[PDB]
Design a protein around this nucleic acid. Structure first.
Lengths: 193, 192
DNA sequence: TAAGTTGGTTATCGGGACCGGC
DNA sequence: TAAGTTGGTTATCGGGACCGGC
DNA sequence: GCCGGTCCCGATAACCAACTTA
DNA sequence: GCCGGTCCCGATAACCAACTTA
């Protein structure tokens, strides 16, 4: 496709150093953790004189000149909407990482789960017991049954969802006070139902 | 170009009501602020019976049906890279707004200015006095002089920037502490 | 903030419906 | 979170360099 | 309206730590 | 590397408050 074929930017002088140094350390200290080895290499990089780092730097600058030529030839043979298409795929990769990071930090601060719908409850009750082998088929058949329920048969889950709706308010009121306590008012909601 | 010709989603029932009500009100209250009028119109909308709101809603829903047809014909005649381009521009518009909001709030919390560079100082001093009438010409000749200054002459601007670098450290350290106090640890730097 | 490694935890995306915040 | 208005600020973009945070 | 999380789990693709330069 | 702000200002293109539905 597009982003696949696109030339990649050269890695830094330190990265080239670690990439070469790592297999050496891993063969001398075979049972040491890899994270330990990287920490030892980076140290070694610091100790290294400036006349030696420059060699790595001169190599990097020259690869960058190659990349500038390469990315030009590549973009020249692309149409304008295709270049925008290229930028979009790159932006998505950034946004997807930022999104991951945020979600990781919110679980770390123990943000309450969102309220489950009656249907969320329904799936939760009927799943181990479902006409299907694969979970994809099992869910597919659970949603079949849900479409055939009258409002009166739904009563148990509607009432299980009204309760969980209340649990959410409580855990949220609590969690948001605590976020103010540790100085994170940015994580509070603007609107409340 | 692309996003320009693209069909726009219909506005909401309330929005339609305000669009029509505003010119009427602006003619009843000629010297009133535009912001008061909207607050008064919105007040009028709440009071409105639901049988009257339904007329507006029904208009909106039929418009929504139109937009679905319109956006389909539009995307149907676009190439795949034009469709990604359309999404990217939409995405650019959101991010640009998010960016304005952030910069708008940081000026409200009085975040310190960034340190001026040696070249920044140089421009500020030597500018009224630059061969030119349009600012574009005055600046182009300022950058000429900057490229021809020796190290002994830049020393003055280099240490004037070294000074401002210190002011930045002072004002930032203070400001970041103040931001932890009003509960915004998110506005803090990760590095230096 | 992103790249290089590499083994050891967490997305994604399958099949859908649905609801809270923005 | 975004749309409508309308008069009233902040982008933009000209000419460039450059540096702090990520 | 739209995005994302929510119920389930099994699948593989993408993470995380350990560093630094640009 | 890349983005954005910074010195300056001059025109013009897109913003702010005031609301609510979806």
């Amino acid at each position: 496709s597009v982003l696949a074929s696109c030339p990649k930017k050269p890695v830094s002088s330190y990265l080239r150093f670690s990439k070469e140094q790592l297999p050496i350390f891993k063969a001398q200290n075979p049972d040491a953790k890899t994270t330990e080895l990287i920490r030892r290499i980076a140290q070694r990089w610091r100790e290294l004189p400036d006349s030696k780092k420059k060699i790595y730097q001169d190599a990097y600058r020259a690869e960058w000149q190659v990349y500038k030529e390469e990315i030009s030839r590549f973009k020249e043979q692309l149409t304008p909407s295709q270049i925008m298409s290229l930028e979009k795929e790159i932006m998505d990769k950034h946004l997807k990482r930022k999104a991951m990071t945020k979600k990781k930090e919110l679980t770390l601060l123990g943000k309450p789960k969102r309220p489950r719908s009656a249907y969320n409850v329904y799936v939760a009750e009927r799943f181990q017991e479902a006409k299907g082998d694969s979970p994809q088929e099992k869910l597919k058949t659970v949603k079949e049954n849900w479409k055939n329920l009258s409002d009166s048969e739904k009563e148990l889950y509607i009432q299980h969802a009204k309760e969980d709706e209340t649990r959410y308010h409580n855990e949220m009121k609590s969690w948001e006070e605590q976020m103010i306590e540790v100085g994170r008012k940015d994580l509070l909601r603007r609107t409340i139902k």
